[PDB]
Amino acid sequence: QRGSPRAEYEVCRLRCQVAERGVEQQRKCEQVCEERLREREQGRGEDVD
Numbered sequence: 656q657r658g659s660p661r662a663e664y665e666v667c668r669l670r671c672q673v674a675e676r677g678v679e680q681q682r683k684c685e686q687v688c689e690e691r692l693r694e695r696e697q698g699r700g701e702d703v704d
Contacts, residue, residue, distance in 0.1 A: 664688050
């Protein structure tokens with residue numbers, strides 16, 4: 656499936672919160688996923704959502 660963007664976003668963060676508990680690592684985790692979300696939200700086409 657396509658999935659829910661925010662769920663994937665949260666999973667992205669969750670992985671780091673549980674597995675890699677480092678400040679900058681976890682920062683990068685959510686930041687790199689958030690910038691992906693930017694392209695997602697600035698580029699919704701006929702996705703149907």
